[PDB]
From a paper:
Cryptic unstable transcripts (CUTs) are rapidly degraded by the nuclear exosome in a process requiring the RNA helicase Mtr4 and specific adaptor complexes for RNA substrate recognition. The eleven-subunit MTREC comprises the zinc-finger protein Red1 and the Mtr4 homologue Mtl1. The zinc-finger protein Red1 serves as the main scaffold for the entire MTREC complex, assembling the individual submodules, including the Mtl1 helicase, into a large complex. Therefore, Red1 essentially acts as an adaptor between Mtl1 and the various MTREC submodules to provide a route for RNA substrates to the exosome through the unwinding activity of Mtl1.
Author numbering:
A (entry chain B): 1017 to 1082
B (entry chain A): 654 to 864
Write the structure that this text describes.
């Protein structure tokens, strides 16, 4: 069984959250630091180097705060 | 143990109906048009349950009724078409850009099912009623501050391959826009819908037939 609410933010408070989500509170899936209007860096996703001053969103920007 | 199977399925059927209601609200153009953005990922699942997985939104447009049929009776969720870059099975036929009056997705295509199959990335017209999730993640797509375009098969391959890589880096799943905290759906009845689903699920998992 898969809850339709499993990917929404209140699932973080479910008592089974840490037993069901491998990364727990560190999970990127439940991170509150993703800017929804900035594209993720395609150089990073491609294995190429960012240009100097790259202003895309990077994986280090979205790693959770708690 | 036979009246108890009845309670189990009654709970599952209440949950199924409330889920359909919740999905309709999230698919409603008043709530989602602002978030149908080129590069954002969309989970496409069709009317019959066929799961196309995650794709990349390329374009969005108001569906126009035919000549023939000025009032076709489309719901609001059926009144808009999202062009999504999806991964089709290698044996999927050519993609008909033009959806007819009664179609949610073109005919003759399907997701990759056979494990060997690498698939083929194509832009597929999908109704908003096929949107079963939106991601906070956006990928870079060719606008013309660049060049390139998804008419180019190699651009489609590259973007699709970066979609596979973003999925690999999200171990626990592509992050979903939360309908309250990211889409700002503030409706009082919508909060009630989510709470009722939660209460029923608590009852479902406490039932011994749940495993
Ligand atoms: Zn970069």
């Amino acid at each position: 069984y898969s809850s339709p609410l499993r990917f929404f933010r209140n699932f973080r408070f479910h008592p089974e959250f840490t037993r069901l989500v491998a990364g727990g509170w560190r999970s990127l899936t439940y991170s509150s630091r993703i800017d929804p209007d900035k594209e993720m860096c395609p150089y990073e996703l491609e294995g190429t180097q960012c240009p100097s001053g790259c202003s895309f969103q990077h994986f280090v920007d979205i790693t959770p705060a708690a | 143990d036979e009246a108890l199977i009845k309670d189990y399925h009654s709970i599952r059927e209440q949950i199924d109906q409330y889920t359909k209601d919740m999905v309709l609200v999230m698919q409603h153009p008043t709530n989602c048009v602002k978030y149908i953005n080129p590069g954002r990922l969309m989970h496409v699942v069709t009317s019959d349950g066929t799961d196309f997985g995650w794709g990349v939104i390329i374009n969005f447009y108001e569906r126009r009724p035919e000549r023939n049929n000025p009032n076709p009776g489309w719901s609001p969720q059926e009144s808009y078409v999202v062009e999504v870059l999806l991964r089709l099975s290698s044996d999927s036929g050519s993609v008909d850009s033009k959806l007819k009056d009664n179609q949610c997705i073109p005919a003759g295509i399907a997701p990759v099912t056979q494990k060997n199959d690498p698939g083929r990335w194509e832009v597929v017209p999908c109704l908003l009623s096929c949107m079963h999730g939106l991601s906070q993640i956006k990928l870079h797509v060719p606008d013309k501050k660049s060049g390139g375009s998804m008419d180019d098969p190699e651009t489609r391959r590259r973007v699709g391959k970066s979609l596979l890589e973003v999925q690999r880096r999200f171990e626990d799943g592509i992050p979903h826009m939360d309908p309250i905290e990211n889409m700002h759906i503030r409706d009082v009845e919508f909060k009630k819908l989510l709470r009722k689903i939660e209460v029923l699920e608590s009852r479902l998992v406490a039932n011994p037939l749940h495993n």
